[PDB]
Amino acid sequence: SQWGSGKNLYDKVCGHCHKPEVGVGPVLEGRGLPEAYIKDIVRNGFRAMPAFPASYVDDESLTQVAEYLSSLPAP
Amino acid sequence: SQWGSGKNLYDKVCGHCHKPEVGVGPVLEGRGLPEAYIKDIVRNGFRAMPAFPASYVDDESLTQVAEYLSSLPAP
Amino acid sequence: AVLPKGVTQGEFNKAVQKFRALLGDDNVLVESDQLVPYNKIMMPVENAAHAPSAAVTATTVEQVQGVVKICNEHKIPIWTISTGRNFGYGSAAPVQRGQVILDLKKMNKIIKIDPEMCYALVEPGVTFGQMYDYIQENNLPVMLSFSAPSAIAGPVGNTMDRGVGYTPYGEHFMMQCGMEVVLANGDVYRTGMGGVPGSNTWQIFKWGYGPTLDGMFTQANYGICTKMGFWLMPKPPVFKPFEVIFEDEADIVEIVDALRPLRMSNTIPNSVVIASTLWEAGSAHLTRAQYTTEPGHTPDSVIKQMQKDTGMGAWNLYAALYGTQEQVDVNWKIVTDVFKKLGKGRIVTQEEAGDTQPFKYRAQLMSGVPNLQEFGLYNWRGGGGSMWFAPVSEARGSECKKQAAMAKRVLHKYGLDYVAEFIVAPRDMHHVIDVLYDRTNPEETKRADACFNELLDEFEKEGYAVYRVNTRFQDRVAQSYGPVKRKLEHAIKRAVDPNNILAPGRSGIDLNNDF
Amino acid sequence: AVLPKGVTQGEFNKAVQKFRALLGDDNVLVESDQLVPYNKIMMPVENAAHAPSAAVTATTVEQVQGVVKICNEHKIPIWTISTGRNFGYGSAAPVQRGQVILDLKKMNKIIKIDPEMCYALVEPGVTFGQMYDYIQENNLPVMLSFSAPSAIAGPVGNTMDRGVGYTPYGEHFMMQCGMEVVLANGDVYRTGMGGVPGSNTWQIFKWGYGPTLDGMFTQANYGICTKMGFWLMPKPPVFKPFEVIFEDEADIVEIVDALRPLRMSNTIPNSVVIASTLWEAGSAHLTRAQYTTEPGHTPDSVIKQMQKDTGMGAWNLYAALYGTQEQVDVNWKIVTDVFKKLGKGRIVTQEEAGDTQPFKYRAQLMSGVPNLQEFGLYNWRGGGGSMWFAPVSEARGSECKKQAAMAKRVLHKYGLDYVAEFIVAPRDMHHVIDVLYDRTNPEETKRADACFNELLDEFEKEGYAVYRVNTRFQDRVAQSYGPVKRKLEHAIKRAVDPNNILAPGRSGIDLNNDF
Ligand SMILES: *Cc1cc2c(cc1C)nc1c(=O)[nH]c(=O)nc-1n2C[C@H](O)[C@H](O)[C@H](O)COP(=O)(O)OP(=O)(O)OC[C@H]1O[C@@H](n2cnc3c(N)ncnc32)[C@H](O)[C@@H]1O
Ligand SMILES: *Cc1cc2c(cc1C)nc1c(=O)[nH]c(=O)nc-1n2C[C@H](O)[C@H](O)[C@H](O)COP(=O)(O)OP(=O)(O)OC[C@H]1O[C@@H](n2cnc3c(N)ncnc32)[C@H](O)[C@@H]1O
Ligand code: HEM
Ligand code: HEM
Ligand SMILES: [Cl-]
Ligand SMILES: [Cl-]
């Protein structure tokens, strides 16, 4: 896998901005965010948030991080 | 003058090798070395000794250093 | 329906078929949805102005050589990116609409990290996060230096734009050693000692023999970097980060003049930072909306208030000491003595600042620990608008004060804020100004575009030019340095890339120019 | 009766008349007696092989521009020298017989020395002796860095060949900032911030914007340097030079491995030197004739004896500490602790050494005080024969030991001595070997020529190449770095000097080559 697991992609990339203690981006943990929405935001980018090409974060890793985040309890 | 005086040329160039305390080149002080010989050695260079173009040390300065060295007492 | 400039659909189609034959269909992107992530930009212009016609991903030098061969056959211009996180400078989008992006993110091998000679040799797709993990997992006694984007950015990409970091190894290009590039004709050239068969000094001695060309490739389009080496700082026994808070805008003069000798003597060895109130605030995650919604720039009264309520100063200095406990103690005494004699500045130690921000993220960047805390700057006004205006300056108090006043005036003229910091070297300052605006607001976007133009004009009138700039202004900035320089750059371009296939427009170098 | 290659007497005559009209008769030298001083060489080949056809002296940029115009008109190749003291590397003679020497020695203005930003801007003819005098007369708080020829050598010429010094600013090209060159087409190009009208950061920030080209001009023939800026080290409160004497040839391994960390951490900040017994002896003014007249290399038993009678070791290390008294004391403890733990090496302080040589000249070079003490090397065997064989090496003990053994084997085969020293950077070594021979002896001269050729061959087989070399071997050494590099170098050459008038042959770059 490109990132091995959704938790690893979160720890190495997304979390540097999205973890509760950082606060650069909104909390995503336990927010029930659909996979389609996560892929959409990541591929297009969103205002202050940068976009990531598939070469950096592929579709499978997005599926994984979406499921990982949904499985967590809301902070 | 290019060097102002024979003593200044000696202090800034020749002496760094020829002064008694240095010993890279032989003592020239008070040796009665003819101006013609000094110009020849400086223009042609001599074995371990490098040559100096007129752009670095002109004829007038060689005349002055020759006279200066001859005026000194032999170490 | 985007095609390269001057390339017919027919020729583009032939090139695409060849890229597929060479790289495989999965490595040739031509669909709009596959290209959208590369198009994300923070510059005040519509996405279309920098839309790529396609993107191809290579993982080997041989594939890159194959790509340039095809590019020369069909006159396809390519824009090379490594990790592509060049936010505020054009990000991953090409300098000219229609170029094909050569995306090297997957060519990500860490070739070598020597813990004794202390150096690394890596491929373009390697990120600092990847290297940090490798160094920790292997318990290697070395540390990294990197831009704030740290974890997601990479050394090859950042160094090709001559970026900077915050440790004593902060001048990245200065610490780079050995580089490999694929030239437009397909030849693989290695700088320094790299061309010597059996050589083991490629990452040891910079220059090599004859012309030393690493610099010629940085901020240029004379080759495609496929490998780059650089030196790593040995991990010291003690790391002591600290901050000094100053209350008045005018203090910058005395701050810089007192700091210069400390940097010059190397007593303070790292690239120090002197952050303005709003940079500090943004990095600490405060937003303008929390203090006001009044139009125009943020009122000086709101800023003085912010300082009052947070403890942040007009200027917030972050630096660090490294070495054995004894070396650090001797140097700390010298530093504290300088500031005590100055009679200004509240010194804040790690024990005092503790786990608070922004001290924490600063201390991490100064010790090579990744974090993206500073992206809080993009939340100051939000909307995705951000351009770096980074004029170079003498590390002299009066100069730094003059530039700050000039920038502030122009930014206010356009309703924007002076959000800045001075990145301090012994003699120079990278005076970094983040021109922030709401890119979703058409009117404000036009103002930011005009503002950037005016900042360049006004600074140039006083003999100041920027060291790096976004793709929308690379031709404009090239003009700042004169025609003789540009003419020479185009002569070299003609010689190493006769078909103008390598990122034409990069730094204003384009054979279509009359140079 | 010397003419440039491929230039008829008629075309040469036209050029000389134009040089006279432009520069004045006194600045155009065509008589044998005026040219002989430029012909003095230490290379194992007759003077004729590097005899110039003429020499012209310019004092202004406009004259240099006029010279290249005339050179292009009549296809006259010119060899540019600044102070011309390149002993062991070809001195002031052209790389190819018949070239016209453009002698810039009279273009000697110190344009600026800023004591606060600590930098200098100078012309080619400026010597270190001239700068030293200026600094002392004006009591400027800065210090210089320079090669042993110090007083008579100069920063522009030395840096154009990427020479080195012995203070923390010893890597001269690394400390160079801002350069002006006249291109073959007559254009005056300024690197870095120099092209910006009204700029005050030419000697402040190195890179500028776009490709940074200073490196491209060093060890190259793409332009004629007419101005060069460089950073100066602020004069520290305390300077503490010291020496460590080691008794065995084999100690080099532990010496280098123990030293590396100290250089890497900057605890010892200057370019340290580890001199072999015969280098030490020559610098101390001892000659081979004082110990033996036996043919061949100096017997190991004569050397062990020399060490016994003088106190010199197989390896003699010279280094220094700089800073406040407190910084120096803390670092001295660290250094002495390293050597005490090593269990080898006799430490010699300045108080102990006194005014004795070679400690005195080493201490002066490490603090920017000029002297020509080291020219004693040319008295070891005398006769005027000397070539620098300077392979680059990892600053790793095993590598340095391997190189020393390889050199010693080849030198002994030809009846010559291993006279060397390692100039130590944090990661690299300039392994400097003085190939000394009696040039008045035909047979020994032939042996020295064969020896140098074999040193290059043998080191190349182990993946080692030199960082700089005399004019007789510049083409041979270019071969060491591979065809792709040379091809790129010739493409650039063709682009910036289509007529091949700038020192063709320099670093093996000559449009007459099939590259
Ligand atoms: C948003 C942000 C950005 C930022 C910063 C703080 C924030 C909040 N602070 C910075 C800092 O401290 N120092 C610095 O140098 N930059 C800072 N930035 C801007 C930026 O994001 C980083 O500089 C980032 O590291 C640049 O991105 P990356 O490292 O991913 O490099 P890249 O996009 O791949 O390449 C940059 C440009 O270099 C040329 N290029 C890249 N690869 C090649 C190859 N292989 N061959 C030839 N040229 C290449 C391109 O012009 C590319 O656009
Ligand atoms: C004999 C000797 C020599 C020596 C040394 C010890 C002794 C006993 N120790 C050295 C040392 O510590 N470090 C070092 O770098 N070199 C050492 N040497 C060799 C040499 O003598 C010096 O390096 C000397 O400083 C070189 O001479 P100089 O400084 O006078 O420079 P140059 O002859 O004028 O120029 C050198 C070459 O650069 C190119 N050139 C010069 N000027 C220009 C301009 N204006 N534009 C373009 N190219 C230029 C030429 O190829 C020239 O030959
Ligand atoms: C890691 C690949 C990653 C993911 C996944 C991700 C997702 C994501 C979503 C779904 C949103 C919208 C959340 C919502 O609607 O509540 C969002 C928003 C922002 N992000 Fe993000 N994000 C990932 C990575 C990163 C990184 C590495 C950064 C910091 C550089 C970052 C930042 C932001 C920001 C800021 C926003 C808010 C945008 C806005 O509302 O204007 N994200 N992200
Ligand atoms: C300064 C311009 C200068 C002068 C003048 C000068 C003169 C000179 C003479 C006359 C001799 C020969 C003396 C004799 O026959 O007894 C001589 C010899 C040597 N020199 Fe000299 N010299 C001047 C300058 C310098 C400099 C700057 C150096 C050191 C780099 C130097 C060195 C030498 C050496 C060595 C010799 C002896 C050469 C040999 O026998 O191999 N000189 N000099
Ligand atoms: Cl951008
Ligand atoms: Cl020589």
Side-chain angles (χ1 to χ4, degrees), chain C residues 79-87 89 104 147-149 153-154 156-158 160-161 163-164 166 223-225 374-375 378 388 467-468 506:
Chain C
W79 177 258
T80 303
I81 59 173
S82 292
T83 36
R85 313 294 77 200
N86 215 14
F87 312 126
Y89 288 121
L104 303 177
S147 44
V156 171
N158 179 269
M160 289 306 285
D161 222 13
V164 293
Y166 304 100
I224 295 165
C225 180
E374 202 169 83
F375 276 69
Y378 303 162
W388 297 111
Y467 91 108
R468 184 182 173 187
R506 173 63 162 139

CSV table of all heavy atoms in Angstrom, one decimal, chain C residues 79-87 89 104 147-149 153-154 156-158 160-161 163-164 166 223-225 374-375 378 388 467-468 506, ligand 1:
chain,number,residue,atom,x,y,z
C,79,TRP,N,7.0,20.8,-17.3
C,79,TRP,CA,7.2,21.5,-16.0
C,79,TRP,C,7.5,20.4,-15.0
C,79,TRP,O,6.6,19.6,-14.7
C,79,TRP,CB,5.9,22.3,-15.6
C,79,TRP,CG,6.0,22.9,-14.3
C,79,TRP,CD1,5.5,22.5,-13.1
C,79,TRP,CD2,6.8,24.1,-14.0
C,79,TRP,NE1,5.8,23.4,-12.1
C,79,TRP,CE2,6.6,24.4,-12.6
C,79,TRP,CE3,7.5,25.0,-14.8
C,79,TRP,CZ2,7.2,25.5,-12.0
C,79,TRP,CZ3,8.1,26.1,-14.2
C,79,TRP,CH2,8.0,26.3,-12.8
C,80,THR,N,8.7,20.4,-14.5
C,80,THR,CA,9.1,19.4,-13.5
C,80,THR,C,8.9,19.8,-12.0
C,80,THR,O,9.2,21.0,-11.6
C,80,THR,CB,10.6,19.0,-13.6
C,80,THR,OG1,10.9,18.6,-14.9
C,80,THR,CG2,11.0,17.9,-12.6
C,81,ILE,N,8.3,18.9,-11.3
C,81,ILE,CA,8.0,19.1,-9.9
C,81,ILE,C,8.5,17.9,-9.2
C,81,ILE,O,8.6,16.8,-9.8
C,81,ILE,CB,6.5,19.4,-9.5
C,81,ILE,CG1,5.7,18.2,-9.9
C,81,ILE,CG2,6.0,20.7,-10.2
C,81,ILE,CD1,4.2,18.3,-9.5
C,82,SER,N,8.9,18.0,-7.9
C,82,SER,CA,9.4,16.9,-7.1
C,82,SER,C,8.3,16.5,-6.1
C,82,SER,O,7.6,15.6,-6.4
C,82,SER,CB,10.7,17.3,-6.4
C,82,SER,OG,11.7,17.5,-7.4
C,83,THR,N,8.2,17.2,-5.0
C,83,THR,CA,7.1,17.0,-4.1
C,83,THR,C,6.0,17.9,-4.3
C,83,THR,O,4.9,17.8,-3.8
C,83,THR,CB,7.7,17.0,-2.6
C,83,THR,OG1,8.6,18.1,-2.5
C,83,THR,CG2,8.3,15.7,-2.2
C,84,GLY,N,6.2,18.9,-5.2
C,84,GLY,CA,5.2,19.9,-5.6
C,84,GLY,C,4.4,20.8,-4.5
C,84,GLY,O,3.3,21.2,-4.8
C,85,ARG,N,5.0,20.9,-3.4
C,85,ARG,CA,4.4,21.7,-2.3
C,85,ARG,C,4.8,23.2,-2.3
C,85,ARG,O,4.9,23.8,-1.2
C,85,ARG,CB,4.6,21.0,-0.9
C,85,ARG,CG,4.4,19.5,-0.9
C,85,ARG,CD,3.0,19.1,-1.1
C,85,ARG,NE,2.5,19.2,-2.5
C,85,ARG,CZ,1.3,19.2,-2.9
C,85,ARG,NH1,0.3,19.2,-2.0
C,85,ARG,NH2,1.0,19.3,-4.2
C,86,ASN,N,5.1,23.8,-3.4
C,86,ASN,CA,5.6,25.1,-3.5
C,86,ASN,C,4.5,26.2,-3.3
C,86,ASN,O,4.4,27.1,-4.1
C,86,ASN,CB,6.3,25.3,-4.9
C,86,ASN,CG,7.5,26.2,-4.8
C,86,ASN,OD1,8.0,26.5,-3.7
C,86,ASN,ND2,8.0,26.6,-6.0
C,87,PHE,N,3.8,26.1,-2.2
C,87,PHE,CA,2.8,27.0,-1.8
C,87,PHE,C,3.2,28.5,-1.7
C,87,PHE,O,4.2,28.8,-1.0
C,87,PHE,CB,2.2,26.6,-0.5
C,87,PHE,CG,1.8,25.2,-0.4
C,87,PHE,CD1,2.3,24.4,0.6
C,87,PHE,CD2,1.0,24.6,-1.3
C,87,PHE,CE1,2.0,23.0,0.7
C,87,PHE,CE2,0.6,23.2,-1.3
C,87,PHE,CZ,1.1,22.4,-0.2
C,89,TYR,N,4.3,30.1,-4.2
C,89,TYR,CA,5.3,30.3,-5.3
C,89,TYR,C,4.7,29.6,-6.6
C,89,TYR,O,5.5,29.5,-7.5
C,89,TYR,CB,6.6,29.7,-4.9
C,89,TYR,CG,7.4,30.5,-3.9
C,89,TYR,CD1,7.8,30.0,-2.7
C,89,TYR,CD2,7.7,31.9,-4.2
C,89,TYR,CE1,8.5,30.7,-1.7
C,89,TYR,CE2,8.4,32.6,-3.2
C,89,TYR,CZ,8.8,32.1,-2.0
C,89,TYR,OH,9.5,32.8,-1.1
C,104,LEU,N,7.7,13.9,-10.4
C,104,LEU,CA,8.6,12.9,-9.9
C,104,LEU,C,8.4,12.5,-8.5
C,104,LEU,O,9.2,11.9,-7.8
C,104,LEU,CB,10.0,13.5,-10.0
C,104,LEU,CG,10.5,13.9,-11.4
C,104,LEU,CD1,11.9,14.6,-11.4
C,104,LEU,CD2,10.5,12.7,-12.4
C,147,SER,N,12.0,23.9,5.5
C,147,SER,CA,11.0,24.9,5.4
C,147,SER,C,9.8,24.5,6.4
C,147,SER,O,9.8,23.3,6.7
C,147,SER,CB,10.5,25.0,4.0
C,147,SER,OG,10.2,23.7,3.5
C,148,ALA,N,9.0,25.4,6.7
C,148,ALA,CA,7.8,25.1,7.6
C,148,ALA,C,7.0,23.9,7.1
C,148,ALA,O,6.5,23.1,7.9
C,148,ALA,CB,7.0,26.3,7.8
C,149,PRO,N,6.8,23.8,5.7
C,149,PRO,CA,5.9,22.7,5.2
C,149,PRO,C,6.6,21.4,5.5
C,149,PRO,O,6.0,20.3,5.2
C,149,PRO,CB,6.0,23.0,3.7
C,149,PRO,CG,6.1,24.5,3.7
C,149,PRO,CD,7.1,24.8,4.7
C,153,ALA,N,7.0,18.6,2.4
C,153,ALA,CA,7.9,19.1,1.4
C,153,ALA,C,9.1,18.2,1.3
C,153,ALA,O,9.1,17.1,2.0
C,153,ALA,CB,8.4,20.5,1.9
C,154,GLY,N,10.0,18.5,0.4
C,154,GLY,CA,11.2,17.6,0.2
C,154,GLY,C,12.5,18.4,-0.1
C,154,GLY,O,12.4,19.5,-0.5
C,156,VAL,N,14.9,18.0,-2.5
C,156,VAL,CA,15.2,18.3,-3.9
C,156,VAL,C,14.4,19.4,-4.4
C,156,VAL,O,15.0,20.4,-4.9
C,156,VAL,CB,15.0,17.0,-4.8
C,156,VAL,CG1,15.1,17.4,-6.3
C,156,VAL,CG2,16.0,15.9,-4.5
C,157,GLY,N,13.1,19.4,-4.2
C,157,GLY,CA,12.3,20.5,-4.7
C,157,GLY,C,12.6,21.8,-4.1
C,157,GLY,O,12.8,22.8,-4.7
C,158,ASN,N,12.7,21.8,-2.7
C,158,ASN,CA,13.0,23.0,-2.0
C,158,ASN,C,14.3,23.6,-2.4
C,158,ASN,O,14.5,24.8,-2.6
C,158,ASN,CB,12.9,22.7,-0.5
C,158,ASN,CG,13.3,24.0,0.3
C,158,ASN,OD1,14.4,24.2,0.7
C,158,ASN,ND2,12.3,24.8,0.6
C,160,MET,N,16.0,23.1,-5.2
C,160,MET,CA,16.0,23.6,-6.6
C,160,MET,C,15.4,25.0,-6.7
C,160,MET,O,15.7,25.7,-7.7
C,160,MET,CB,15.2,22.7,-7.5
C,160,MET,CG,15.8,21.3,-7.8
C,160,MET,SD,17.6,21.4,-8.4
C,160,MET,CE,17.3,21.9,-10.1
C,161,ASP,N,14.7,25.4,-5.7
C,161,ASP,CA,14.2,26.8,-5.6
C,161,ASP,C,15.0,27.6,-4.6
C,161,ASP,O,14.6,28.8,-4.3
C,161,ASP,CB,12.7,26.8,-5.3
C,161,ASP,CG,11.9,27.8,-6.1
C,161,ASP,OD1,12.4,28.3,-7.1
C,161,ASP,OD2,10.7,28.1,-5.7
C,163,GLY,N,15.4,27.2,-1.4
C,163,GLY,CA,14.6,27.5,-0.1
C,163,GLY,C,15.5,27.5,1.1
C,163,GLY,O,16.7,27.2,1.0
C,164,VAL,N,14.9,27.8,2.2
C,164,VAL,CA,15.6,27.9,3.5
C,164,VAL,C,15.0,27.2,4.7
C,164,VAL,O,13.8,27.0,4.7
C,164,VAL,CB,15.8,29.4,3.9
C,164,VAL,CG1,16.8,30.1,2.9
C,164,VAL,CG2,14.5,30.1,3.9
C,166,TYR,N,15.6,26.5,9.3
C,166,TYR,CA,15.9,27.2,10.5
C,166,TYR,C,16.9,26.7,11.5
C,166,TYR,O,17.0,27.1,12.7
C,166,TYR,CB,14.5,27.3,11.2
C,166,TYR,CG,13.5,28.0,10.3
C,166,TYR,CD1,12.6,27.3,9.6
C,166,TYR,CD2,13.6,29.4,10.1
C,166,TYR,CE1,11.7,27.9,8.7
C,166,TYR,CE2,12.7,30.0,9.3
C,166,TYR,CZ,11.8,29.3,8.6
C,166,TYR,OH,10.9,29.9,7.7
C,223,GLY,N,17.9,21.6,-16.9
C,223,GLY,CA,18.0,20.2,-16.7
C,223,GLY,C,17.0,19.8,-15.7
C,223,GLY,O,16.3,20.6,-15.1
C,224,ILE,N,16.8,18.4,-15.6
C,224,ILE,CA,15.8,17.9,-14.7
C,224,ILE,C,16.5,17.1,-13.6
C,224,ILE,O,17.2,16.2,-13.9
C,224,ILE,CB,14.9,16.9,-15.4
C,224,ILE,CG1,14.1,17.6,-16.5
C,224,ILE,CG2,14.0,16.1,-14.4
C,224,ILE,CD1,13.5,16.7,-17.5
C,225,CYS,N,16.4,17.6,-12.3
C,225,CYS,CA,17.2,16.9,-11.2
C,225,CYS,C,16.5,15.6,-10.9
C,225,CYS,O,15.3,15.5,-10.7
C,225,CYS,CB,17.2,17.8,-10.0
C,225,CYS,SG,18.1,17.0,-8.6
C,374,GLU,N,2.7,26.4,11.2
C,374,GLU,CA,2.7,27.7,10.5
C,374,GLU,C,1.6,27.9,9.4
C,374,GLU,O,1.4,29.0,8.9
C,374,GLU,CB,4.1,28.0,9.9
C,374,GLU,CG,4.4,29.5,9.7
C,374,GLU,CD,5.8,29.7,9.4
C,374,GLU,OE1,6.2,29.6,8.2
C,374,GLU,OE2,6.6,30.1,10.3
C,375,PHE,N,1.0,26.8,9.0
C,375,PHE,CA,0.0,26.9,8.0
C,375,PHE,C,-1.2,27.7,8.5
C,375,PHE,O,-2.2,28.0,7.8
C,375,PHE,CB,-0.4,25.6,7.4
C,375,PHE,CG,0.5,25.0,6.3
C,375,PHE,CD1,1.8,24.7,6.6
C,375,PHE,CD2,0.0,25.0,5.0
C,375,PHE,CE1,2.6,24.2,5.6
C,375,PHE,CE2,0.8,24.5,4.0
C,375,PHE,CZ,2.2,24.2,4.3
C,378,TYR,N,-2.5,30.8,6.7
C,378,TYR,CA,-3.5,30.8,5.7
C,378,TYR,C,-4.9,30.9,6.3
C,378,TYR,O,-5.9,31.0,5.5
C,378,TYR,CB,-3.4,29.5,4.8
C,378,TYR,CG,-2.0,29.3,4.2
C,378,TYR,CD1,-1.6,28.0,3.7
C,378,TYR,CD2,-1.2,30.4,4.1
C,378,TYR,CE1,-0.4,27.9,3.2
C,378,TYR,CE2,0.1,30.2,3.5
C,378,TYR,CZ,0.5,28.9,3.1
C,378,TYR,OH,1.8,28.7,2.7
C,388,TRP,N,4.2,34.8,-1.7
C,388,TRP,CA,5.4,35.3,-0.9
C,388,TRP,C,6.1,36.4,-1.6
C,388,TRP,O,6.5,36.3,-2.8
C,388,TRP,CB,6.4,34.1,-0.8
C,388,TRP,CG,5.8,32.9,0.0
C,388,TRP,CD1,5.5,31.7,-0.5
C,388,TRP,CD2,5.5,32.9,1.4
C,388,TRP,NE1,5.0,30.9,0.5
C,388,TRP,CE2,5.0,31.6,1.7
C,388,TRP,CE3,5.6,33.9,2.4
C,388,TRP,CZ2,4.5,31.3,3.0
C,388,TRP,CZ3,5.1,33.5,3.7
C,388,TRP,CH2,4.6,32.2,4.0
C,467,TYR,N,14.3,37.2,-4.0
C,467,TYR,CA,15.1,36.0,-4.3
C,467,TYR,C,14.4,34.8,-4.9
C,467,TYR,O,15.1,33.9,-5.3
C,467,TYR,CB,15.8,35.6,-2.9
C,467,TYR,CG,15.0,34.5,-2.1
C,467,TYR,CD1,15.5,33.2,-2.1
C,467,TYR,CD2,13.8,34.8,-1.5
C,467,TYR,CE1,14.8,32.2,-1.4
C,467,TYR,CE2,13.1,33.8,-0.8
C,467,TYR,CZ,13.6,32.5,-0.8
C,467,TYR,OH,12.9,31.4,-0.2
C,468,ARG,N,13.1,34.9,-5.0
C,468,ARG,CA,12.3,33.8,-5.4
C,468,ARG,C,10.9,34.4,-5.6
C,468,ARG,O,10.5,35.3,-4.8
C,468,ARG,CB,12.4,32.7,-4.3
C,468,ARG,CG,11.7,31.4,-4.6
C,468,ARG,CD,11.9,30.6,-3.3
C,468,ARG,NE,11.1,29.3,-3.3
C,468,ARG,CZ,11.0,28.5,-2.3
C,468,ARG,NH1,11.6,28.8,-1.2
C,468,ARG,NH2,10.4,27.4,-2.4
C,506,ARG,N,10.3,29.5,-16.8
C,506,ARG,CA,10.9,29.4,-15.5
C,506,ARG,C,11.9,30.5,-15.3
C,506,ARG,O,12.8,30.6,-16.2
C,506,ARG,CB,11.6,28.0,-15.4
C,506,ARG,CG,12.5,27.8,-14.1
C,506,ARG,CD,11.6,27.8,-12.8
C,506,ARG,NE,12.3,27.1,-11.7
C,506,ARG,CZ,12.3,27.6,-10.5
C,506,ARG,NH1,11.7,28.7,-10.1
C,506,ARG,NH2,12.9,26.9,-9.5
E,1,LIG,C1,2.6,27.6,3.0
E,1,LIG,C2,3.9,27.8,3.6
E,1,LIG,C3,4.9,27.7,2.6
E,1,LIG,C4,6.3,28.0,3.0
E,1,LIG,C5,6.6,28.4,4.4
E,1,LIG,C6,5.5,28.5,5.3
E,1,LIG,C7,4.2,28.2,5.0
E,1,LIG,C8,3.0,28.3,5.9
E,1,LIG,N1,7.8,28.6,4.9
E,1,LIG,C9,8.8,28.4,4.0
E,1,LIG,C10,10.2,28.4,4.5
E,1,LIG,O1,10.4,28.4,5.7
E,1,LIG,N2,11.2,28.1,3.6
E,1,LIG,C11,11.1,27.9,2.2
E,1,LIG,O2,12.1,27.8,1.5
E,1,LIG,N3,9.8,27.9,1.8
E,1,LIG,C12,8.8,28.1,2.6
E,1,LIG,N4,7.4,27.9,2.1
E,1,LIG,C13,7.2,27.8,0.6
E,1,LIG,C14,7.2,26.2,0.2
E,1,LIG,O3,6.0,25.6,0.5
E,1,LIG,C15,8.5,25.3,0.4
E,1,LIG,O4,9.5,26.1,0.0
E,1,LIG,C16,8.4,23.9,-0.2
E,1,LIG,O5,9.4,23.2,0.5
E,1,LIG,C17,8.6,24.1,-1.7
E,1,LIG,O6,7.9,22.8,-2.1
E,1,LIG,P1,8.7,21.5,-2.4
E,1,LIG,O7,9.7,21.4,-1.4
E,1,LIG,O8,7.7,20.4,-2.5
E,1,LIG,O9,9.4,21.6,-3.8
E,1,LIG,P2,8.7,21.5,-5.2
E,1,LIG,O10,7.4,22.1,-5.3
E,1,LIG,O11,8.8,20.1,-5.6
E,1,LIG,O12,9.8,22.2,-6.1
E,1,LIG,C18,9.9,23.7,-6.0
E,1,LIG,C19,10.3,24.3,-7.3
E,1,LIG,O13,11.6,23.8,-7.7
E,1,LIG,C20,11.7,23.5,-9.1
E,1,LIG,N5,11.8,22.0,-9.3
E,1,LIG,C21,11.4,20.9,-8.5
E,1,LIG,N6,11.8,19.8,-8.7
E,1,LIG,C22,12.7,19.9,-9.7
E,1,LIG,C23,13.5,19.0,-10.4
E,1,LIG,N7,13.6,17.8,-10.1
E,1,LIG,N8,14.3,19.5,-11.5
E,1,LIG,C24,14.2,20.8,-11.8
E,1,LIG,N9,13.5,21.8,-11.2
E,1,LIG,C25,12.7,21.3,-10.1
E,1,LIG,C26,10.3,23.9,-9.7
E,1,LIG,O14,10.4,25.3,-10.2
E,1,LIG,C27,9.5,23.8,-8.5
E,1,LIG,O15,8.3,24.5,-8.7
